[PDB]
Amino acid sequence: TPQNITDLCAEYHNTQIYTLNDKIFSYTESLAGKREMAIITFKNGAIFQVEVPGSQHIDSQKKAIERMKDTLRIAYLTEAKVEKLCVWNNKTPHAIAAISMAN
Amino acid sequence: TPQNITDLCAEYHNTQIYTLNDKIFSYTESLAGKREMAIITFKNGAIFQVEVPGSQHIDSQKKAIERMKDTLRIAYLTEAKVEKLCVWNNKTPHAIAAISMAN
Amino acid sequence: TPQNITDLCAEYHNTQIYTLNDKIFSYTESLAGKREMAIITFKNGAIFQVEVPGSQHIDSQKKAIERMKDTLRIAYLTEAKVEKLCVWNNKTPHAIAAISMAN
Amino acid sequence: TPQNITDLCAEYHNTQIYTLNDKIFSYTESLAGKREMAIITFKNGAIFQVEVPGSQHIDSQKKAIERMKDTLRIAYLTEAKVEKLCVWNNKTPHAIAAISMAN
Amino acid sequence: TPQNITDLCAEYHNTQIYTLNDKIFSYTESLAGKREMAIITFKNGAIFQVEVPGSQHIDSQKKAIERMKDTLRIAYLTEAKVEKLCVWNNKTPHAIAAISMAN
Ligand SMILES: CC(=O)N[C@H]1[C@@H](O[C@H]2[C@@H](O)[C@@H](CO)O[C@@H](O[C@H]3[C@H](O[C@@H]4O[C@@H](C)[C@@H](O)[C@@H](O)[C@@H]4O)[C@@H](O)[C@@H](O)O[C@@H]3CO)[C@@H]2O[C@@H]2O[C@@H](C)[C@@H](O)[C@@H](O)[C@@H]2O)O[C@H](CO)[C@H](O)[C@@H]1O
Ligand SMILES: CC(=O)N[C@H]1[C@@H](O[C@H]2[C@@H](O)[C@@H](CO)O[C@@H](O[C@H]3[C@H](O[C@@H]4O[C@@H](C)[C@@H](O)[C@@H](O)[C@@H]4O)[C@@H](O)[C@@H](O)O[C@@H]3CO)[C@@H]2O[C@@H]2O[C@@H](C)[C@@H](O)[C@@H](O)[C@@H]2O)O[C@H](CO)[C@H](O)[C@@H]1O
Ligand SMILES: CC(=O)N[C@H]1[C@@H](O[C@H]2[C@@H](O)[C@@H](CO)O[C@@H](O[C@H]3[C@H](O[C@@H]4O[C@@H](C)[C@@H](O)[C@@H](O)[C@@H]4O)[C@@H](O)[C@H](O)O[C@@H]3CO)[C@@H]2O[C@@H]2O[C@@H](C)[C@@H](O)[C@@H](O)[C@@H]2O)O[C@H](CO)[C@H](O)[C@@H]1O
Ligand SMILES: C[C@@H]1O[C@@H](O)[C@@H](O)[C@H](O)[C@@H]1O
Ligand SMILES: [Ca+2]
Ligand SMILES: [Ca+2]
Ligand SMILES: [Ca+2]
Ligand SMILES: [Ca+2]
Ligand SMILES: [Ca+2]
Ligand SMILES: [Ca+2]
Ligand SMILES: [Ca+2]
Ligand SMILES: [Ca+2]
Ligand SMILES: [Ca+2]
Ligand SMILES: [Ca+2]
């Protein structure tokens, strides 16, 4: 089991770490059919999504996807500093696999 | 996959973007049978609903509807600025499909 | 579809409106068997319940009943001003059907 | 249907009301197998549990037990004054049936 | 039934109490397949996980595992003092069984 976000992300092909050290600049969420997703941006221009749940996901991931959207919303509203995001770079916008927060 | 609320909105027939750049003025919620819904308003007079779940909604939208009501409630209680809403303008009040929050 | 709490409330028999314009004074909840409910009070002495879920409630209402109790708890904790309640007056205490909040 | 915690409590055998009028001093929760429970303490040394779900609870209590643990966590974190707890006194620690908050 | 975290922890093999008396330094959450987990850190260098759910967990633990991740997130965002953690020390990072907060 990895002990940090960087090591976790390195377990996956098609992932990279973005180091933001910044609060989330905007938060977007959609309930439209086939676009049940969230999109966040940062002041530097980065745009990331939480993917629409789908065939690329195993059943163990469905609760986690819902948790990640909960996390991003509350981070946005508390202005919480996002340290790193582990993201899939084989999707546009890049898709969030993991997030770390620190003061 | 779209990169913002505007492009997302444009993927659907009968939707429109409203730009509010304002906090939610009022939040209303009902548990009454056949009226399990939320209604928000803005200072400018805009009134928007999250629809009662029914046959216009595919199963994947169900969770997303419940999430949208959570988001609108907490956005209200935190006085969070709403940037844009993507809505179905074929319903009265207009029905929320997506929301973006930013300053 | 109604556009406000008053018009919603009018769609049902045995309901009335209270206009509190005040924060919730007290919040109570219970997990005891057959009494899985919440009760709220206002400074003016009004007492209201979210009913125990039951045969009088259609399946679509079950999720809404849970949400209502979530809303009341967070409204209480943030000292959010309640504008109006729509309640059923054929129950004792009067039972909440819908709520509106505005600053 | 009762109108307050004291009357609700009096509808059950092996219950009593504690009147704390204080915030929760400590919050403990466990995910360990067979001890999926929460424990609260008050500064006066009183200790209470939310029981591990079990055959002593009817299905309708299952959601309400989960709500109670949510309520105690957020009360702890917001330093909300707990007015009274109704508890079953044939358990050790005494088991929470209901809570009121006021202040 | 135990009355505190130290006694609860002692009912299990391969556990120990860590006494932190400090807020969470970092919170990390992942939705990546087979790594649906959370990791927290403390200023002192301690790293702990909430395990990916697996065959080492019974059905009654599933909801509590989701609850714990909810608790850690909100503890982190509130800068809540964590008193103790009961952890499995035959996992790396050590795996959270129970948490107590007090300040
Ligand atoms: C920083 C890092 O870890 N790795 C690389 C990487 O980063 C760029 C790559 O993700 C491309 C993919 O198109 O997007 C660039 O950002 C765009 C923004 O694109 C949006 O945000 C990213 C993160 C993706 O989700 C993408 O799908 C989104 O559309 C766009 O919104 C606008 O801001 O323009 C920038 C490019 O200027 C990534 O660039 C990196 O992040 C941006 C925000 C900015 O900080 C750049 O300075 C930074 O490089 O690939 C690039 C390729 O040049 C480099 O190798 C990075 O080192
Ligand atoms: C009785 C008691 O509470 N602790 C013992 C115990 O503690 C050390 C032990 O848990 C080892 C792992 O076997 O880890 C040491 O911490 C590492 C950090 O490791 C991470 O956090 C711990 C808690 C585990 O989850 C581990 O899997 C994680 O990797 C590591 O991140 C880095 O910071 O280095 C430290 C020190 O090696 C535990 O050490 C204790 O806790 C740390 C935070 C610090 O306070 C240490 O000074 C302290 O000893 O075992 C040691 C003997 O190894 C002592 O008996 C403790 O009393
Ligand atoms: C973005 C866009 O295309 N806007 C055009 C649109 O806006 C009006 C329509 O959306 C109509 C359709 O009913 O409602 C108008 O607003 C009413 C308001 O309606 C409630 O809120 C709107 C957003 C809808 O969800 C309705 O279903 C709701 O009932 C009433 O509650 C209010 O009392 O009165 C206003 C009219 O003043 C929309 O008005 C626009 O948005 C409002 C909030 C104001 O900003 C107003 O100035 C705008 O015009 O249709 C108009 C036609 O005049 C324009 O073409 C807009 O571009
Ligand atoms: C109110 C009391 O508080 C503590 O002393 C517990 O050990 C008792 O069992 C009871 O819960
Ligand atoms: Ca700010
Ligand atoms: Ca702000
Ligand atoms: Ca901080
Ligand atoms: Ca204000
Ligand atoms: Ca006050
Ligand atoms: Ca306000
Ligand atoms: Ca204080
Ligand atoms: Ca207060
Ligand atoms: Ca601080
Ligand atoms: Ca405090």
SS3 labels along C9-41: HHCCCCEEEEEEEECCCEEEEECCCCCCCEEEE
Closest by CA position to B33, among listed E10, D20, E18, C61: C61
Q: Give the three-class secondary structure for E47.
A: strand
Give first-to-last CA distance, chain A, whole Å.
25
> Per the omega criterion (within 30 degrees of 0), is the bond before E2 cis?
no
Which residue from A1, A61, A83 is facing E31, i.e. has the nearest CB?
A61
B77 alpha carbon, closest ligand: 10
CA-proximal residue: ligand 2, atom 32 (nearest): E45
CA C60 to chain centre: 17
Could you tell me if B38 and B93 are in contact, meaning their C-beta atoms sit under 8 angstroms apart? no
Q: Residue A102 and residue A100: Cα distance in Å, rounded?
A: 7
- Residues forming beta bridges with residue D71, ordered by sequence position: none
For residue A38, give the CATH number of its domain: 2.40.50.110
The amino acid occupying position A86 is C
Write out the two tokens for B72.
Answer: 């609108």
| Torsion angle in degrees (nearest 10) through CA of C40, C42, C44, C45 | 20
Ramachandran angles phi, psi of D37, nearest 5°: -145, 170
Three-state secondary structure readout of chain A: CCCCHHHHHHCCCCEEEEEEEECCCEEEEECCCCCCEEEEECCCCCEEEECCCCCCCCHHHHHHHHHHHHHHHHHHHHCCCEEEEEEECCCCCEEEEEEEEEC
Residues whose CB is less than 8 angstroms from the CB of residue B54 and which lie 6 or more positions away in sequence, other chains included:
none
Write out the two tokens for C7.
Answer: 């018009």
Chain D hits for E98, CB-CB cut-off 8 Å, are: 28-32, 35
Cα D50 to Cα D28, D39, D44, D92: the distances in Å are: 10, 6, 19, 11
Closest atom of ligand 1 to CA, residue A91: 27
Contact criterion met (CB < 8 Å) for E36 and A63 = yes
Closest by CA position to D27, among listed E27, E98, C17, C8: E98
> Quick check: CB of B88 below 6 Å from ligand 3?
no
Resolution, given in Å to one decimal, reads 1.5
Write out the two tokens for D95.
Answer: 């088991």
User: What is the full DSSP assignment across E48-98?
Assistant: EEEPPP-TTS-HHHHHHHHHHHHHHHHHHHTTPPEEEEEEETTSSSEEEEE
The amino acid occupying position C71 is T
Q: Residue C60 and residue B32: Cα distance in Å, rounded?
A: 9
Strands (DSSP E) found in B14-75:
15-23, 26-30, 37-41, 47-50
Could you tell me if E32 and A8 are in contact, meaning their C-beta atoms sit under 8 angstroms apart? yes
CA-proximal residue: ligand 4, atom 8 (nearest): D93
Could you tell me if A61 and E31 are in contact, meaning their C-beta atoms sit under 8 angstroms apart? yes
Contact criterion met (CB < 8 Å) for E4 and D49 = no
Chain E hits for D48, CB-CB cut-off 8 Å, are: none
Count the neighbouring beta carbons within 10 Å of the beta carbon of residue E64: 27
Chain C hits for D96, CB-CB cut-off 8 Å, are: 31
Q: Residue A20 and residue A27: Cα distance in Å, rounded?
A: 15
Q: Give the three-class secondary structure for B24.
A: coil
Write out the two tokens for C34.
Answer: 């057959």
Q: Rounded to the nearest whole angstrom, what is the distance from the C-alpha of residue B83 to the centroid of ligand 8?
A: 17
Best residue for ligand 4 mutational test, from D18, D47, D86 (most atoms within 8 Å of Cβ): D47
The amino acid occupying position D101 is M
Range of the domain at B30: 1-103
Bridge pairing between strands C47-50 and C94-102: parallel
Count the neighbouring beta carbons within 10 Å of the beta carbon of residue B1: 15
Could you tell me if E6 and D26 are in contact, meaning their C-beta atoms sit under 8 angstroms apart? no
Q: Residue D6 and residue D85: Cα distance in Å, rounded?
A: 9
Q: Residue D69 and residue D71: Cα distance in Å, rounded?
A: 5
Question: Based on the structure, what is the number of domains in chain A?
Answer: 1
> Per the omega criterion (within 30 degrees of 0), is the bond before C93 cis?
yes
Q: Residue C53 and residue C66: Cα distance in Å, rounded?
A: 9
Eight-state DSSP code of residue D9? H
Contact criterion met (CB < 8 Å) for E27 and A101 = yes
Eight-state DSSP code of residue E21? E
CA-proximal residue: ligand 4, atom 5 (nearest): D46
Q: How far is the alpha carbon of B3 from chain C, nearest alpha carbon, in Å?
A: 31
Write out the two tokens for A20.
Answer: 């933001």
Count the neighbouring beta carbons within 10 Å of the beta carbon of residue D7: 12
